[PDB]
Amino acid sequence: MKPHPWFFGKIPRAKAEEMLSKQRHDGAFLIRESESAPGDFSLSVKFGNDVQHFKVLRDGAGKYFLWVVKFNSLNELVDYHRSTSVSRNQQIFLRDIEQVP
Ligand SMILES: CNC(=O)[C@H]1[C@H](C(=O)N[C@H](C(=O)N[C@@H](CC(N)=O)C(N)=O)C(C)C)[C@H]1c1ccc(OP(=O)(O)O)cc1
């Protein structure tokens, strides 16, 4: 197995922006522990010359979600959005960031 190159843990929202703005592919993303919602997570995605942010929401059942579809894990939420757009207004598919070993 191998660890997921998308979990950055505790990193400021603005830092996620600086990092993702340097990626070249739209969809480059990362999950970070929320700064406005301590104890939760946020998803930051590169799209054009901007970095969009999404709240990773939770329900009383412990599920994770962005919109209506609910997932049992962060991993499944992430993977689902590699083939279905994370945005309703735009077609944005998640793709791992390019990192040099
Ligand atoms: C300045 N405020 C924002 O960044 C708006 C961001 C937002 O609304 N994003 C759009 C959106 O419509 N999000 C939906 C879906 C979602 N799950 O975020 C929503 N607001 O419920 C998205 C299409 C770019 C919502 C946001 C606010 C905080 C946040 O966590 P954090 O950055 O850690 O403080 C993550 C996202």
Closest CA to 80 of 99, 56, 52: 56
**What is the dihedral angle through the alpha carbons of 55, 5, 22, 99, rounded to the nearest 10 degrees?**
180
Pick the CATH number of 1-101 from 3.30.70.120, 3.40.1280.10, 3.30.505.10, 3.40.50.300: 3.30.505.10
Experimental approach was: X-ray
The resolution of the experimental structure, rounded to one decimal in Å, is 1.9
Residues with CB under 6 A from ligand 1: 13, 34-37, 42, 52-55, 57, 66, 87
Q: Are 15 and 8 in contact (CB under 8 A)?
A: no
Burial annotation 9-30 (CB, 10 A radius, 16+ → b, else e): eebeeeebbebbeebeebbbbb
The per-residue DSSP string of 6-75 comes to TB--S--HHHHHHHHHT--STTBEEEEE-SSSTTSEEEEEEETTEEEEEEEEE-TT--EESSS-EESSHH
Given ligand 1 and candidates 30, 43, 55, which is best to mutate, with the most ligand atoms within 8 Å of its CB? 55
The number of beta carbons lying within 10 Å of the beta carbon of residue 45 is 24
Q: Are 58 and 74 in contact (CB under 8 A)?
A: no
The number of beta carbons lying within 10 Å of the beta carbon of residue 42 is 19
In whole angstroms, what is the distance from residue 13 CA to residue 30 CA?
A: 11
